[PDB]
Structure 1
Amino acid sequence: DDMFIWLCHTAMSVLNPGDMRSRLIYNHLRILAESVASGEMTQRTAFRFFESAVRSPAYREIAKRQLEGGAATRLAGISAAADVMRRMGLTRRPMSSYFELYQRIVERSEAMTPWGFPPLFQFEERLSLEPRLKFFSRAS
């Protein structure tokens, strides 16, 4: 279940994560997801892995040919992030993946400075927030 939280971050917490339909970045995301499930990686580590992953030479300067302030469109991100949870066997009932990933985003849409996060509380760290105030959490 924390998986959905992670995926929410990869979808909404990252400006310009390249074109997320392309098999390259898509495979990055797939692998990292399967590594957040089965506990092989920390969420923080997998996130910093995702944003630091290799995309394409002169990335920013190709980004000047698409984006103004470097914020891409979020559809590709959510469609890929649902796709990965479906193709990996993550849930017993297929729909649940997409529903949760969608729902958790919709609830956060109403929050002040919604897509930014304090770096310490964003993921697993020594000191944490109470389960009500955790970010994409079911208890908010």
Structure 2
Amino acid sequence: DTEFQALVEFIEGASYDQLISGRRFKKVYDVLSENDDMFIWLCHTAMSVLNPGDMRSRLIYNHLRILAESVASGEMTQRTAFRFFESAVRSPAYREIAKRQLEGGAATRLAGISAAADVMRRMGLTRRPMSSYFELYQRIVERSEAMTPWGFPPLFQFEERLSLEPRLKFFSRARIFWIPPTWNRAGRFLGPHVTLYPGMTPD
């Protein structure tokens, strides 16, 4: 266990220098957040809103299950996996299945994320054998991907462009977005090398 070892090193350091410094907390924030359970929970909460009887949803379910198992094995990197996930999410078949599950009313997504937590426990997709149920509780009681009505985190990178155009007011109407260098006075440290994002301010 490297996380308990880093916690032991944090306790020994905080007892040594008798203050809460910036180095040790950054070290244990980097150790406790090395897990890829976020993307596995993304794929499994996308699998939860599907239909176990429809063959198209069976194809999407097996595709996202293979994607999550390839992420947990370390054979596929995170960026290409995110490309695969956003290509599977932006398809109109998955969005139509999510709309049908919204129009149902007695939706099976709660049993979906519960079986997802059981699968992540059984297949070893977590760091601790009982951490998936606390992560399920965290997905339920907080604003997350599980409370979204379509089953993905609500960023504009996971929503279609033809729905992005009439809603949002971006730079010019009728990829990586940048500030053009005509703005010589944008902010204090803002410039052309500072990227901007459509639906969020990451600053």
State TM-score, norm by structure 1: 0.45
Percent identical: 99
Matched, 1:38 2:38: no
Instruction: Report the Cα offset of residue 72 of structure 1.
Output: 3.5
Cα 1:76–1:60 change in 2 (3 A) is same
Higher relative contact order (CA 8 A, sep 6+): 1
Contact 1:8 1:101 in 2 (8 A): no
Cα 1:98–1:9 change in 2 (3 A) is same
Contact 1:7 1:101 in 2 (8 A): no
RMSD: 9.0
Cα 1:62–1:90 change in 2 (3 A) is closer
Larger Rg: 2
State TM-score, norm by structure 2: 0.35
Specify every segment of 5 or more residues in structure 1 that has no aligned partner in the other structure, as ranges.
none
Instruction: Report the Cα offset of residue 100 of structure 1.
Output: 1.0
> Whole-Å Cα distance in 1 between the matches of residues 84 and 115 of structure 2?
17
Contact 1:121 1:129 in 2 (8 A): yes
User: Which range moved further: 49-58 or 103-112?
Assistant: 49-58
Instruction: Report the Cα offset of residue 32 of structure 1.
Output: 2.1
Cα 1:24–1:70 change in 2 (3 A) is farther
Cα 1:87–1:30 change in 2 (3 A) is farther
Contact 1:82 1:98 in 2 (8 A): yes
> Whole-Å Cα distance in 1 between the matches of residues 111 and 171 of structure 2?
20
Instruction: Report the Cα offset of residue 99 of structure 1.
Output: 1.3
Cα 1:84–1:57 change in 2 (3 A) is same
Partner in structure 1 of residue 171 of structure 2:
136
Specify every segment of 5 or more residues in structure 2 that has no aligned partner in the other structure, as ranges.
1-35, 173-202
Higher helix share: 2
Contact 1:35 1:41 in 2 (8 A): yes
- Count of residue pairs brought into register by the alignment: 138
Which residue, 62, 66, 74 being the options, matches 2:101? 66
Instruction: Report the Cα offset of residue 78 of structure 1.
Output: 0.6
Cα 1:78–1:70 change in 2 (3 A) is same
User: Which range moved further: 111-120 or 40-49?
Assistant: 111-120
Contact 1:20 1:26 in 2 (8 A): no
Contact 1:36 1:42 in 2 (8 A): yes
